[PDB]
Amino acid sequence: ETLNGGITDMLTELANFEKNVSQAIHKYNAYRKAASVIAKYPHKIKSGAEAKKLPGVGTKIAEKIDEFLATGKLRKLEKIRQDDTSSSINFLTRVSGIGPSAARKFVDEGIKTLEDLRKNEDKLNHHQRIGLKYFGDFEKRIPREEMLQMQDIVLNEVKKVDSEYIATVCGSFRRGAESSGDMDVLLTHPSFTSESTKQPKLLHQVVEQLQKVHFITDTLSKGETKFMGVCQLPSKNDEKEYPHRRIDIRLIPKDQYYCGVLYFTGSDIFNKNMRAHALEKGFTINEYTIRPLGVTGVAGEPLPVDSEKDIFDYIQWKYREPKDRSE
DNA sequence: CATTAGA
DNA sequence: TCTAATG
Ligand SMILES: [Ba+2]
Ligand SMILES: [Ba+2]
Ligand SMILES: [Ba+2]
Numbered sequence: 001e002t003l004n005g006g007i008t009d010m011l012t013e014l015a016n017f018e019k020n021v022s023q024a025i026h027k028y029n030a031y032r033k034a035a036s037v038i039a040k041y042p043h044k045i046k047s048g049a050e051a052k053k054l055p056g057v058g059t060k061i062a063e064k065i066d067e068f069l070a071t072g073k074l075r076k077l078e079k080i081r082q083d084d085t086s087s088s089i090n091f092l093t094r095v096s097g098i099g100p101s102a103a104r105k106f107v108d109e110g111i112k113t114l115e116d117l118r119k120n121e122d123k124l125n126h127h128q129r130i131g132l133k134y135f136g137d138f139e140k141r142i143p144r145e146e147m148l149q150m151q152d153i154v155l156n157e158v159k160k161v162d163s164e165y166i167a168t169v170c171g172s173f174r175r176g177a178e179s180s181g182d183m184d185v186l187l188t189h190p191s192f193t194s195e196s197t198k199q200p201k202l203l204h205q206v207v208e209q210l211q212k213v214h215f216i217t218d219t220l221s222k223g224e225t226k227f228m229g230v231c232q233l234p235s236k237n238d239e240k241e242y243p244h245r246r247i248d249i250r251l252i253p254k255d256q257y258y259c260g261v262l263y264f265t266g267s268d269i270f271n272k273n274m275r276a277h278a279l280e281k282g283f284t285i286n287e288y289t290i291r292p293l294g295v296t297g298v299a300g301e302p303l304p305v306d307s308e309k310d311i312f313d314y315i316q317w318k319y320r321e322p323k324d325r326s327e
Numbered sequence: 328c329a330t331t332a333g334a
Numbered sequence: 335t336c337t338a339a340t341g
Contacts, residue, residue, distance in 0.1 A: 099339050127332080127339080184341090220340085221331050228331080228340070248341080250330095287328090330340085 003044045010068050011035035020100045021086040034061050088112040096131030130218050137243035142180045147173045157209040170264035176323050182246035193253035200224035203251045225251040256288045258305045263287045270325040281315040
């Protein structure tokens, strides 16, 4: 967590590069398990040779560690940080809709900048287009104060369309977080569960609602069970318009909510942790259900949930308010 | 790890 | 169809 820091940090630094600037999925995969193990190790790596003893740790990386240990840096590292192509690859990527594949492609053509991008709006798809459009706002954080605002509206229209709707705003927000990145809306309906062969429209209904009133301002991608978008709080009595914000709406079988709800709310560790525990408690938790464990090794058969509670009761734990689901 | 776009 | 991009 800190005694093996630089290494893991230097390491990840290294792995990301392979993945991104290069297409070295394996090298990449390499640097990572390394950065992984050297991270778990209970002692200050004093030398490469030391480290090397490790699993994942080969002569290539060990070599890296002494060089880092020795001098407070790394050339490969200094070199890459300096390299313009590589710089450009890291940069275009932040564009929503821009992946590494695309990143290199653009660069190859010579589209290294923000402006490059505008000048060639044509070479961009709709997604990438919007991405480009709202580059600033997309990067910008979302004050909780806003999340309240957003969540308000969202709930109203959901209700307006059908009162049988169930929408919850999942994420760190859900968890009290003073600020969020985008808004996560897990949606459901009685009329939509495990078997009941869809009702795509169910999704379709609300999107349209959010639109009609001007909440949704763009579509990144809309499917029959998972919409991806852009929104904007109505800009007041002028002088202060609100930044475009990424939203995300997903349909859900009413018979899979709470798990997913439980799940999407995190935290990553809370999650994992509760999960660890259901295992002992003779269960299995996953984004969709909760099954009872069968000694033979495994078992199936999803227990019935009607609330975040049920899941709790099941693994006989203390109900934890989303607030304190931090870990 | 699953959904969407797209070409 | 595949393959990239989000989460
Ligand atoms: Ba080894
Ligand atoms: Ba991106
Ligand atoms: Ba998200």
